[PDB]
Amino acid sequence: RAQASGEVAQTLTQADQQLSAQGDQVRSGLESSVDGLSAKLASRILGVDVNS
C-alpha cells in the first residue's frame, strides 16, 4: 500500500504538470475564439447583429 500510494502520487504530479501545460496552451487557442463569443453576446443584448 505504501508503494501504491507513492506511485499514485507520482502519476498525480505528472498528470497535474501535463494538465497545466494543456490549459496554458489551450488558453491561447481560445483567445482568438472568445472574440466571436463576445460579439455574439453583444448582438443578442443590443437586439441587432453588431459586427464589431
Next chain:
Amino acid sequence: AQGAQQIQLMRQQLIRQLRTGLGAEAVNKAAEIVRAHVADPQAQSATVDRFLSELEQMAPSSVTSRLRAASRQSLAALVEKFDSVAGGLDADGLTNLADELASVAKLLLSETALNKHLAEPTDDSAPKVRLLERLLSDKVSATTLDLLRTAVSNRWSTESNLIDAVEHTARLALLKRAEIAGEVDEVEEQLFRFGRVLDAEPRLSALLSDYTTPAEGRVALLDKALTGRPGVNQTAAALLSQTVGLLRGERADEAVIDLAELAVSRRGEVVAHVSAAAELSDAQRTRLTEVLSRIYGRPVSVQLHVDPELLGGLSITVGDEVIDGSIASRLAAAQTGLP
C-alpha cells in the same frame, strides 16, 4: 482507482477554472463592445424605438399612500369642499387664501397642544369650530375660516395629518390660480426642474432640510440662490417657498417631487419618470406618451431624466411599477446569468 478519480477531479477543476476565466473575459469584452457601439446617437434612437415597439406589444393592464382610510376620506372631503368654495375666487383671492392657509399651518406648527386638540377625532365638530373661531375668526378671511372649519370637522388618523391636509389645500389654491393664469405646463416643468437640481445638489437640500433653523433664513437662502432667478415663474417660486416653509423633517427634493405629483394629479394625468441616456425626439416623446397611456389607460405625462449610465434604452416608472428596458440592466443580467 482513488488516484484515477483524483486525476479526473483535478481535470474537472482545471476545466471549471477555464470556464470561469473565459466567461469573465467574454462578458467583459461584450460590455466593452456594447459601450463602444452605443456611443452613436443613432444607435440610441434605434434602441429606444425597439423598446417602444416592445411596449406597444406589451399587454395593457387595468390595474397619498401614507394616508390611512379615515385620513384619505377626510382629505377627499376637504379637497371636494375646496373645489366647491375656491372655484369662484380670483387670482388675488386664491393667493390670499394660500397665504392664510400657510400662515395657519405655521401657527399649528408653532404650538402643539392646539394641533392635538383640533386634530383629535370626535363625532361632533361644533366645539372644534367654536375653538377655531375664538382663536382666529378675525385674522383669516371667510373662505379660509370655512375651509379650516371643514378640515377640522372630519377626523384624521394622526395630528400631523391635519396640518398636512391644510398644507395640501394651500398647494391646491396656488395650483388653482396657476390654472387661472393658464401656465400650468410651465409651472409643472419648473417644479420638475427644481426637483432635478435639488437632487443634483444634495448639500443644498440638506441645508434646507434642517427644520430647526428658522424658516425665514432657509426661504431667503433659496430665493437668492435657486427660487429667485430671472427665468423662474412667480407661481412656482411661491409654491416652492411655501413648501420649504412647511418642511417638517422631510427632504426638500422629495417635497418638490410631491408638489409635482400633486400638480400633475390635479390635471388628471399621472407622472411617468423615464430615465434615458439621451434626449428623445418629439416623435419619440409622443409615441412614449401614447403607449404609456394605452397600457395604463389614464393619460400620462412623461418626465425625462437624463442618465448616460443606462447606455441606451429606457427605464419607465409609475407609482410602484417599473419597466426596466435600460441596456445597462440587460448587460448586468447577461453578466449575472452566465454559467
Next chain:
Amino acid sequence: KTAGRVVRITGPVVDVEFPRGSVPELFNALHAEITFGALAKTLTLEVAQHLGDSLVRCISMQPTDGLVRGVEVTDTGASISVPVGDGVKGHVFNALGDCLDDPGYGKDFEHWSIHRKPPAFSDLEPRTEMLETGLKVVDLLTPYVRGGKIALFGGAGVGKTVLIQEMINRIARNFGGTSVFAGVGERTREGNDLWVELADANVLKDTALVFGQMDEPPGTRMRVALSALTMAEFFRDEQGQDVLLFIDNIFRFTQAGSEVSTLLGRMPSAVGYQPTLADEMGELQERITSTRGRSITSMQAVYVPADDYTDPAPATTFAHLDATTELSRAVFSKGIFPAVDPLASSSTILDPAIVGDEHYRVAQEVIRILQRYKDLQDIIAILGIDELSEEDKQLVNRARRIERFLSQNMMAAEQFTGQPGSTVPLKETIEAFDKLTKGEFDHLPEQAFFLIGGLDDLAKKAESLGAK
C-alpha cells in the same frame, strides 16, 4: 465631494453619513482622522452595516478616543488589504498588514483583500495522512492529520500556549514549507517571546507573524485572524507550498465578535453571545482548509471560558476540526503534562483503516482502561481502592500507571524545569502501551512513569527508584 462624515460614535463603533450614491459597500475600508495631539492618528473603519438614509455602521480597527462628530470620512473603494508574497516571511505585521519590525516594509508588495470566499466544495478533499509529533498521548489517542485541522482546547493556564510552542518545535523546525502564526488577543509579551524564539532557532526566516493582541479594539482582534489567514491562503494557492498555520487564540476572535455585536445593537444570544456566532466561526474556519493538492496544516488554541466546555464558543468550534486535544484542569492538577484529557480528545483518523489494526487496538484498550478507572472515582474518592474487586484493583493500578505514562517531558517544558524533552517514535509508543495495558509493568512504581519518554527512559527511571 463624495466624502462622508461621522454622525455617531459608540466606543469602537462609528456611524458615518454619506451623500447618496456614494454609500460604501460592505466591508470597505474607510479612513478618518483623530487630531488631538496626544492621540492623533488615522482611524481605519470597516463598514459593517448599512443603516439606511445613507448611513453605515463601521467597526474601528483603532481606539476611537479623541474622535469628533462631523469629521471627514473618506472611502477607499476596497476592503482592508494585507501584503502577500514570499517577502512577508520573517517579519511581524498587525491586523492591517503594517510591518512592526520594519515600519513601511511591504507597501510595494502585492496586496490581497482579507475578505474572500472559502474553496468551492468541489475543491475539498478529505485528509487522512497521520502527522507524527513524538508525543505519546497525541500519537496514540489523537493522531494529528497532515493538512488537517487540529485544535487545542483548554481552560486558563492549562498549557495551550506551551503545547503550541511544542508543536512549533516538533513540526515547524524541520519543515520544508511556510509557517504563519496569528496572535489573536493573546499576551503581547508572548508574541515578543515567540518572535525572539523563532529568530534564535532560525525558523523565523520561514515564518510570517501577524499580531493583534489583548490591548487592541475588538475589530482588530476579529480581523487579525483574517489577515493571517489571507497570507496563508496566498501561500497555499499562488505558490503550492505546504503551509503551517498557528492561531492563538481563536476564542478571542469569537469574543471580539461578541463585543462588536454588542456595540452594533444586535440582539444578544445564549450567554450573551452574538447571534451570528456560528456563522462567523463558519466562514473563518472554512477558509482555513486544505484543497486538492494544496495543503494547510492548521493548529488552533481554543480557550474554554470558566473551564466550561459547554460554552457556545468552543462548542461551535468543535465541529470544524479534524483532531481535537482537550486539556483538562483535572489532569493539569495531577501534574501531568501535557494536561490532555484522553477520554475527551479525539481524532478523525483514529480508526483501524488508517492507523493500522494494532495501533487502534492499543488505543482502544487504553481508553477502555481509563474510562473504567474514571467510572470508579465515586467509589474510590470515599472508600479508596480497598473495597474494589481484585480485577478492579488491578485495573486501577494499571490505569494510574497508564495515565502517568501518558505524560511526557516536552521540549518547550525545559524553560520551566531545566530538563530537556524527549521524542518517542510511534512504534515505540504503541509497543510500550501494549505492554503496559497487558500488566507487564505493574511491579514498577507509579512515579517511574511520570514525565519520561520511551521504554528506555521508563527502565532507567524504575532502576533509579529501585525497581527493575
Next chain:
Amino acid sequence: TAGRVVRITGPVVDVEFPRGSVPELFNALHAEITFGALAKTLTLEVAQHLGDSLVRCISMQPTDGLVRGVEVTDTGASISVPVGDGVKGHVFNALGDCLDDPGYGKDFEHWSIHRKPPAFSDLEPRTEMLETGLKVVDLLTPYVRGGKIALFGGAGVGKTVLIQEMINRIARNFGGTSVFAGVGERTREGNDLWVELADANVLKDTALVFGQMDEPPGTRMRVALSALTMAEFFRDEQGQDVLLFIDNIFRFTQAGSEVSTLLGRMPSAVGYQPTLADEMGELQERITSTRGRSITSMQAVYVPADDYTDPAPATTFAHLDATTELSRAVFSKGIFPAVDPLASSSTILDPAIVGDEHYRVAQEVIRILQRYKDLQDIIAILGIDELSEEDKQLVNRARRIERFLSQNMMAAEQFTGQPGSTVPLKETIEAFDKLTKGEFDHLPEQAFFLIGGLDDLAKKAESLGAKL
C-alpha cells in the same frame, strides 16, 4: 365593512377594519390565500384589540402566501364546531371540519368553542372509584368515576401507551359517549388510534378531534377547546356519561407560549406566557363533572425535560383528582407501566372510600418503597451486606414489590410481543398484602416481572424453578 391585512409575522396577523366594524375578541375572521400551490382560506381568531381599529389575530393555518392588504371578512362569531350524536364515529379537526368525510357535519348544530365553566353551585366532589385492572393504578393511584385523571411524564415514558390501555380497559365496556382530543401529538399516532378504535368497534361511540403537532400554534390552542365543546354538549344536552381523553394537554399551554411574545406579552419565568395559569385554569375548569352529569376526563401531561418543577406541570397539578406520575428512572429500569408510586396520588386513596384494607396495604407499600429509595445510595456504595437484617429483608421485599407493580398491558403487546392481563382489585390487595408480609421472599425477584395476578406469579416461578 371588511378588514385588511397590515402586518404578518408567522402565525400572527394584524388586521385593520373601518371604525364601527372592529370584530369582538375571539371572533373568527376569514382571509384568502390565492397562490395556487398554497391556496386556502385562513381562519384568524381575534386575540387582541390594538386600538385605531387594529386587531391582532392568530392564524389557524400556515400564513404562507398571505399578502398585505387582502380582504379580511368578519364571521361575527367565534369558532363554532358541530355538536350532536352525529359527530360520534368521525374524525374532526380544531375547526370542526370532518376529515374521514369532508363536508359531513355542516348541517349539524354548531356551538362556539369558547364557553364559561359551570357555576360553582353546580359543582360536586366525586368520590367513586373507577377500577381499571392495573395493579399499580388500582392499588396506589385509584381513579375516580366522573373525576379528573392525569398521566404525567416526560417524553417517551408511556403516557400514550397508558392512554391506549385505559381506552381498552374503560371505553370498550363503557355505555356512554367517548371523546378523544389529539392535542399537538403525532399524526401517525392519531391514525393508529383511529384504526385501532375502528377495529375494536368503539369508534361508533367515539368522536375524534385532532389538531396535530405540524399545525400552527392556533390550531394547537383551539383543538382542546373544540373537543371539550363536544364533550360539554354531550354532558349538558344529552345528559350522557362521557369519557374525555386528551393527549397531550401540555401542548395547549406550549402553543400559547409559541405566540405569547408575538402578541406582545413580556415573558414570565421559564419562558412561559404570563397568562399560563389563567388560560390553563379556564380550560381545565371547563373539564369537569357537574351534579348529575358525569365526565370522566383523562389527560396526558407532558413534563418538559422530566422536570416536575416546570411551571406547566406544576400549574396543571392543581386541577387533578388522580395523578399517575410516570418516572424516567422507573422507565429506564425496565418497569412498565413506569409509574412512580412515591409521586402518584389520588384524592380517594383514604380509608373512608377504599376501605381500611386497601388503604393499609397501599400505605405499607409506599413505606417500603420509600425506605428502599432511602437505602439505594447506601446499597450502591457500601453494598447490601452492610444493612441490618430488617433493612436487608425490607430491601428484598421492596425489590419484589417494585417489580410486581409492573404488569403486562394489552396495549403493550406490540412492544413486548406478549398478551396483556387484568387483575381484580381484591386480588391486587391480597397479593400486595402477602408481599408486604413477606410471604413471597423465597421466590426469585425476576418471577415478579411483567405478570398479572398470583396465578401468573406461580407459573413464572415454576418456569424459573422456584415454588410459590
Next chain:
Amino acid sequence: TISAADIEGAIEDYVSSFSADTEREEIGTVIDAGDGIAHVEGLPSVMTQELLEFPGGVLGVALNLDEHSVGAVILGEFEKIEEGQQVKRTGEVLSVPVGDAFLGRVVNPLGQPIDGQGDIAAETRRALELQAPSVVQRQSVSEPLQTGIKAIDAMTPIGRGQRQLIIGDRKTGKTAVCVDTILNQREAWLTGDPKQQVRCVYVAIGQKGTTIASVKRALEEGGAMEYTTIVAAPASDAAGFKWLAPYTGSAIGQHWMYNGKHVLIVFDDLSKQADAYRAISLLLRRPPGREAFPGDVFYLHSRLLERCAKLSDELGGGSMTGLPIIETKANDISAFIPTNVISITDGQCFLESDLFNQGVRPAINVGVSVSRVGGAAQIKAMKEVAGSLRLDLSQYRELEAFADAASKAQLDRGARLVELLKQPQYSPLAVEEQVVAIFLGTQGHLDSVPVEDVQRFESELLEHVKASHSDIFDGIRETKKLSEEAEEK
C-alpha cells in the same frame, strides 16, 4: 486534453440562449441591510415566504411583512446587498427542483449542484412548505427499514415512515450509524424492486466541507452514491441555507414518497438548523425565548419532521423515513432543542460517550432508547428473538447497578447479550444473520462460551452457517420467519 470545442460550445449555449423580457414589475428598495438580513420597502403585493431577487442574482425570503417594509433573509451571498438596490418580486414561494436526476448528486438547499458535475435534469418543482399527509392519508408503519445494526434492528427497530432520532454527545457515532443505515440499503437497491428499493437523502447542516466530502467518499466506496442525494449546507453557508437545507431535502424526498418510492432522509444535524434559525430570528429582531431561541423553533422542527410519513395505499403506498441527528452538550437531554426533538420523533437512539469508551459500539443506551413503532417494524423472527431482549437488557443493567443463583445466571446472560450487540463500524449484518445472532443470544446458546469469546463465536459460527447450512438463512430471508424445522436444524 481539454476539448476547446466542448467548452466553446458550453458557453455558446448560454450566449445564444441569453434572453431578458421586459415586464411590468413591482419595485422594492433595500432600505437597510447587514449580517445576512435586508429590509425592502415597496412590493405591496409580496407574499409571505416569497422568494425575492436582489441584483447580482442574489436571493432572499420575506419573513416579516409589516406596513413600513419587508424583512428578508438573504440566501447565499449578502455583502453584495446595498441600500437603494432594486429588489424584484418572484411570484413564487420557496420551491426546489425535484426528480430522479438528483440521485447521486450533491446540491445546495436551492437544488443547485455544487459537486461540479453538470446541471441536474429536474423533473418538476416542489414547494418547500407543502402540508404533511393528513390523519386519513397515512397507514400504520409495518415495513422494517433494516439498518444492519444488531442493536438498533433488535431493540429500537425502525419502520418505513418512522422518525427515529439519533441523539448524543459529539463523537459518539451518530453519523456512523446514519451512514451504515444508508449503506445497508445497497442490497435493497440492487434488487431493482421499487417496493424494496430505498432512496436515501443525506442533509448536512452547518457541517465542515471536508466532513461532507469524507461522508460522500464513504458512500461512494460502498456504492450507496447510486441511490443517495446530498443536500449540503456547510458552515460557510449563510444562515438562510442552513435553515432551509432540511426542507430542501424533505421536498426532494417527498417527490419520491408521493410516487410510491421509499425514502430515507438523514438530517445531520437539526441542532445547527435550530442555531441558524435562532440567528435569523435575532437579526430580524423577533422576541427571543429559552436560550434566546424563537418561539416557533418547536414548530420549525415539528412541521419538518411530520412530513416523514408512510402513505396509505390510495396515495401510492410510498414512505419517507426520518433520521434526525441531535448533538447534546455534556450529555444533557434536558436542553431546549433536544427536549423538543425527543418529544417530536417516534423514538430515539441515545448514544453515550461513556458507553462508547467502555467498548460498547454502537454506544446505544438501552434503558432510555426506544422505538415507538415497536415490533411492527420487525420481521417475525426478529420479533420472536428481540421483544424480550430489549427489556431484559434494561433489567440486566439495573441488576448490575444493584450488585443468589438466579441473580448470577441473570448477570451472565445479560453480559453475554451485551457483548452480542457490539458491532464494528462498516460491518453491516443482513437481517437473517441478525436473527441467527439474537437467537444465539436469547435462547441460551452463548452461556457455555466465555464472555470474552462471545463476539468471536458469533462471527465464526455465522460464517460457518454461511458456508454450510446456508438454507437456514434462505428460510428466514424467504418466509421472514424462523420455521420450527429451521430452528431445530
